[PDB]
Design a protein around this nucleic acid. Sequence first.
RNA 1: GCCCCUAACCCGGCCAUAGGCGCCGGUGCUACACCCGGUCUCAUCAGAACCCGGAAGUUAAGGCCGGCGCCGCGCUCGGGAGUACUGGGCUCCGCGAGGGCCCGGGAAACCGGCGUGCUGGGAGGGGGC
RNA 2: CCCCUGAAAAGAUAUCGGGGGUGCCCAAAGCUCGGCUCAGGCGGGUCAGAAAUCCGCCGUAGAGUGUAAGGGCAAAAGCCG
Lengths: 169, 200, 98, 146, 178
Amino acid sequence: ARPARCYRRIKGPPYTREEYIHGAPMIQIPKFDMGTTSAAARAAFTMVAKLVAEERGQIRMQALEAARQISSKYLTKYVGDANYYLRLNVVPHHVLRENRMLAMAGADRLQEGMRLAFGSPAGRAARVEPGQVIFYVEFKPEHLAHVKEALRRAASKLPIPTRIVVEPK
Amino acid sequence: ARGARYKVPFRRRREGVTNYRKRRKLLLSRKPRLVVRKTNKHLIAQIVIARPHGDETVVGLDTRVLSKFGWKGDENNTSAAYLLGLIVGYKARAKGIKEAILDIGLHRPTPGARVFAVMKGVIDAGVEVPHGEEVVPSEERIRGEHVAEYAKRLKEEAPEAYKARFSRYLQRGLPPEELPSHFEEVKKKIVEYYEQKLAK
Amino acid sequence: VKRTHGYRYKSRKLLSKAPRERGMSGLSRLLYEYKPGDKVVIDIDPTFISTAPHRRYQGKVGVVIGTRGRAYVIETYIGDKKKIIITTPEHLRPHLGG
Amino acid sequence: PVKHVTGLRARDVMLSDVPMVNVRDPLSSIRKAFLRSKSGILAVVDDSGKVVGFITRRDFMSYIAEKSLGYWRRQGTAGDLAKSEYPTVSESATLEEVAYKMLAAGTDYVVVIDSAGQPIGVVTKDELVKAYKERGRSVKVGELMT
Amino acid sequence: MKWKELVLVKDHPMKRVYIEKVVVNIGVGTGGERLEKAANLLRELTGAEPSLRRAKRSIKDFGIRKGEPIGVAVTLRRDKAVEFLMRALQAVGNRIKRSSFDERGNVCFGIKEHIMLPGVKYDPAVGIWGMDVCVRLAKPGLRVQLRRRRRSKVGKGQLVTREEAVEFFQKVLGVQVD
RNA sequence: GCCCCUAACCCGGCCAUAGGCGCCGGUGCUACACCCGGUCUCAUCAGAACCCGGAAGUUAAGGCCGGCGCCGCGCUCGGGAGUACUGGGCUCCGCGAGGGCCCGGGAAACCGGCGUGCUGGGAGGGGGC
RNA sequence: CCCCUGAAAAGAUAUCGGGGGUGCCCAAAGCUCGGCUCAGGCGGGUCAGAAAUCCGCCGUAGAGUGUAAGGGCAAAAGCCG
Ligand SMILES: [Mg+2]
Ligand SMILES: [Mg+2]
Ligand SMILES: [Mg+2]
Ligand SMILES: [Mg+2]
Ligand SMILES: [Mg+2]
């Protein structure tokens, strides 16, 4: 897997319609809403933390999942799943392409160089704008320090700069 | 109806009075139309010229106009259809109409129906309406022989049913058997009025 | 690959209709009797596409030169070239600007 | 170029009620069933009455010859013998096409399948010879003898 | 007790009830000579010409193709419908299920074999057939949904109801409704 | 013969402010219907329909008019919002993708409010010439 | 050669750019007239069943329209005669 800097910049149109894309990769994110998702339970919480993007860019699906585990594991063992709701707000609809000489990947991949340079599907990413909310945490005001620490941990696994915004519901 | 993607049809189409596919073919002729319409009691005949903002009607009359010439039969029998045709035919010529095209709407073009009965009277007045030779009713049904023979056979069989099946015929003063005689009576008074009018 | 040139080769958005304009179109455009010298707008009707002019003439203004049976002979221009369009009134509108 | 034909279709020459053996009948029952039925063909069905194949005399004999062959070294059920796959012709099938199918598939018979896909009858060599008997052309045997 | 006088007149003369039409159905698979027997049977049973109802779709599991006649039906009107209806109701036994009624003044029942019908006898060259009997009840003013010009929907108050239908058979047809 | 006014009817234009669900009414001399029959023209399995002949009944329904609620819809109305986006200039910021400033244009969803056919020609009816 | 996209709301527009198709087929799948309404769902109905024929209600086209894609089409451009 190439460095994420190869796929950070938004350089072309979105590539999402999977009826026209051959071999479009499946989304390997198992869960998007962590904690207590039921609306009756979330009325206990009263504070909202948002990990907001600062630059527009593309976040790979593996980077989204990596930030998801480190943040959710920390809130699991420092806050308890019954004391928070954590949602990954974005979905990686954009399909990433790569142009490399490979195995049986179609007949036109055997031609080296920039001839027939349209790449094959190499992953998925989310295209985000500035101010877009990446992670959404509903929580109670006593655990504000822990939720910031978990969100700061998730920020360390993301390719673009992000800032934490804390506001009440 | 439901949702924005629903398409409500045309008002005349959804009310069920205008076949727009047939109307477009009629509008392609670029000639005045002879609208013939049928009701439970009366018959309508009109000479209509279509305009972009709405049809202009030149002459439009119902079967009530025959009372001006003392008609004493049923308002929408075959003979009443032919008499109604002559007046709209004559008044159309006084408005300058030399030719027209039949427009029977949602009615079937069965042979011998009253809609061709109305068109026959229009043709006799002097307005050319092109038509099929084998749909116009015969003279015997035009002059009401089918009505007279029905009453004459029914009187000799069930006279009690005579006074109910032709209850209004008697009160006008005309037994249905003299309808063929009465038809030639009315036809001269419509003819002589409009011919003598045409002299001046 | 270079652009294919069918008679209607980029007419997806041009020939599409909104949901509110679905079905048969009204017959008032059949009832405009154009004379020689009047100005008309070429407005293609997607429901009668067999008799419609080319997409390059959409939105253009011509001069009625005459009638051919039931079509109207219309004189128009494409940039600098004088073109002769022969179309029925269902693909026309009167020009009210002059 | 053989030309003149019966005009007879497959449904005329059919045998409707083929003798049947259930799938878990051993081979001794197969010989006894062949003896009782007097037929050159049997149809095998399961516990649910579902026909799965047809056992012909030649297949049974060849199976016995291949399986039970050793004498220098001197010192099952019916389902194993049946063939589910056979030449098939619908009800309107003609004798010429039926004979061609039987020859090409190398079977003693031909299983007729309906439009719905179900067997209703089988026609073998013997009913073909008999249909020749009621209709068949005039030929000397020198042009048919082996 | 003819068709005009089996009316269930309500408090409005325009609210009367009658039998709009009674129809008989024969669903026979494909048999052309069988269907000819079926057409002959209804032609003698009802006194009216049958109708060959072609297959709407082709289903290979039934071995049927669209466009072939695989049914016989006939629509009975004023006088012919009542007489067969009385004749049919004898074979049923003066008994129709309450659940057999629909919510639109309609009811159908099936006679398993026509030898139970009056005026009928066994025939070995035609066999034994069962039928569907569909009888429709209506009020005056139902033509508004069926005329060609100015077609419209009948009002809610001018449609035969499932309650008004069952009362029709008990009091006017004298049929036991259980 | 003519000008004027005017329901339900006929022929239209635009084709939901016109549609859909439910509720409460008005309309019946004429007109519109339901309606009554099948000799004739005409038609089908079936006079159901179409076609023909008619007038006992009925405003029960259709039609037309009035009112209310809901959905749908419309608006050159208020907020959203001079927002998003954008034509032109820039030795203006940023490592960079990008952003900013000045001149000129300027939404959409959504929220609230309002509206729920308008109208052309003829027939019939009234008035006057 | 043909359709959509690229293509930047007139026109035009390339790449060994993306998704696809063409070298036919049909005496009816061509012409016209008339009638009907499709997918699907529901209620009732002997065989009969998820599905056959029959009676009714709903049903914006969710069908069909030879064949790619896009467009058009409901008293029709679909189905039946
Ligand atoms: Mg780029
Ligand atoms: Mg070129
Ligand atoms: Mg052509
Ligand atoms: Mg362009
Ligand atoms: Mg047609």
